[PDB]
Design a binder for this molecule. Structure first.
Ligand SMILES: OC[C@@H]1[C@@H](O)[C@H](O)[C@@H](O)c2[nH]cc[n+]21
Length: 483
């Protein structure tokens, strides 16, 4: 590469006073990824198609009709990837297992070739001293199940998921001691079924059809039951023998009141309710948020008594995926007519106060750089939910995809991002938050869902022509801070 690639960035060596000794004994630092975003071999090695394979087929879905058939090809270059992880000082890797790579049809026939891949992967991490954190679901429902009964929209999914979970616990649990059932069921439900932005692209006006007033609530409900059903398998059959732990990964945008009024304060709490409460209130309290029940009414399913008991306390810890924050305003008087889950929040978003933007915007349209947001979010979870064990399970930011190696590696904006967010995380911990780990999204630039390869989130740059890896300055910033 060009000489400027090798300029030594002084920011690499400013850890902002952070080290392992600024965190609890045993605190875990890792990176996070997902099966579809990094594996490749989408249509090979036995893997049956998922909803994203079909979704991607519609022209104009991914920019430049790009695909994840290869992406960064972690399927073949996992040893290199794990080696970078170890060399940069990380303790852990949160990956996901692909459901349809294990069960090409979602239920029934096991794909032994898929099982073999995950065994290779996990065994290699253990060999190198990287702790495996396995996530069971990251947007990749087997297409068959969507075809049979529309996947998350059917109560049939619950036992289908629990069986897949069961198999994974049986198969991988001798060395995986850290499980998550779902990555961000709120996005699975909202992007899948409210605005159709993600697979299977259902919504009120969408080509695929759908109903934004009802389907996201149906989906969310079945995701919760599926989580609880899977955890029940874990607890009853595996937990006391494998001695591991199981949680869920929940996204949480911080919602800050725009002003001190009762109205704006209530708006911010209302947003938290619909964004996080939706899943965390059932799991901690066995019930939905009050605001949701009153606003959404008949459109929300209800839990039976049995269901409520299965759902309550169905985690050993909660993963919080946190990136960004917004101001929240009371939007005036509310219609009235059901329109969508997002509309049901009855809030106004604001991105600046007194001419000052809440923060700089990263590449992604939704990502505003607001480090103090991570402190408020974690503290809120501490105060609202009885100080549960937490993992800060995703955090990072993106550069535009169209940049050269030479430019891509000097990501001092990302160094600032981490220094500042990790610093604000430390404060919330120092103040009592029971956070036991932190994971950066992501090790490698990868397939960014609807943004394709126009968004680079990695701390390692990937040349998509050659699949060669180039650690960015931020990787070295971690390496330095972690020793
Ligand atoms: O947008 C960057 C990343 C995605 O790539 C991940 O798959 C997803 O877990 C997520 N949630 C919030 C931000 N992100």
């Amino acid at each position: 590469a060009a000489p400027f690639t090798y300029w030594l960035n002084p920011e690499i060596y400013d850890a902002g006073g952070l080290s392992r000794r600024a965190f609890p004994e045993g605190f875990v630092f890792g990176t996070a990824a997902s099966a579809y975003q990094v594996e490749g071999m989408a249509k090979q090695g036995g893997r049956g198609p998922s909803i994203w394979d079909a979704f991607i087929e519609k022209p104009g879905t991914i920019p430049n009709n790009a695909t994840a058939d290869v992406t960064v090809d972690e399927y073949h270059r996992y040893k290199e990837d794990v080696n970078i992880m170890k060399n940069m000082g990380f303790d852990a890797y949160r990956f996901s297992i692909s459901w349809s790579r294990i069960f090409p049809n979602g239920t029934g026939m096991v794909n032994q070739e898929g099982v073999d891949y995950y065994n290779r992967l996990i065994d290699y991490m253990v060999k190198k001293g990287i702790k495996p954190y396995a996530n069971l679901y990251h947007y990749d429902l087997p297409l068959a199940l969507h075809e049979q009964y529309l996947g998350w929209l059917s109560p049939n999914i619950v036992e289908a998921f629990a069986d897949y979970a069961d198999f994974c616990f049986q198969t991988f649990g001798d060395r995986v001691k850290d499980w998550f059932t779902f990555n961000e069921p709120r996005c699975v439900a909202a992007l899948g079924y409210d605005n159709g932005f993600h697979a299977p692209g259902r919504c009120s006006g969408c080509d695929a059809g759908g109903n934004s007033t009802t389907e996201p609530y149906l989906a969310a409900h079945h995701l919760i039951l599926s989580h609880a059903a899977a955890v029940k398998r874990y607890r009853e059959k595996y937990q006391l023998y494998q001695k591991g732990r199981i949680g869920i990964l929940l996204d949480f945008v911080w919602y800050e009141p725009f002003s001190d009024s009762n109205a704006d304060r209530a708006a911010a709490q209302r947003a938290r309710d619909f964004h996080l409460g939706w899943f965390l209130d059932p799991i901690i309290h066995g019930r939905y948020p009050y605001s949701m029940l009153e606003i959404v009414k008949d459109r929300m399913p209800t839990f039976s008594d049995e269901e409520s008991r299965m759902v309550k306390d169905s985690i050993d810890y909660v993963g919080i995926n946190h990136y960004t924050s917004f101001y929240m305003k009371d939007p005036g008087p509310w219609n009235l007519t059901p329109t969508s889950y997002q509309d049901d929040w009855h809030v106004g978003f604001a991105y600046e106060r007194n001419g000052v933007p809440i923060g700089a915007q990263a590449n992604s349209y939704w990502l505003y750089i607001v480090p103090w947001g991570i402190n408020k979010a974690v503290t809120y979870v501490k105060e609202t939910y009885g100080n549960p064990t937490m993992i800060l399970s995703e955090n990072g930011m993106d550069q535009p995809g169209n940049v050269s190696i030479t430019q891509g590696v000097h990501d001092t904006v990302r160094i600032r991002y981490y220094r500042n967010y990790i610093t604000e995380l430390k404060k919330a911990i120092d103040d009592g938050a029971k956070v036991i780990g932190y994971f950066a999204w992501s090790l490698l630039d990868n397939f960014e869902w609807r943004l394709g390869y126009t968004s680079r989130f990695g701390i390692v740059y990937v040349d998509y022509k050659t699949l060669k890896r180039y650690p960015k300055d931020s990787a070295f910033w971690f390496k330095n801070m972690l020793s």
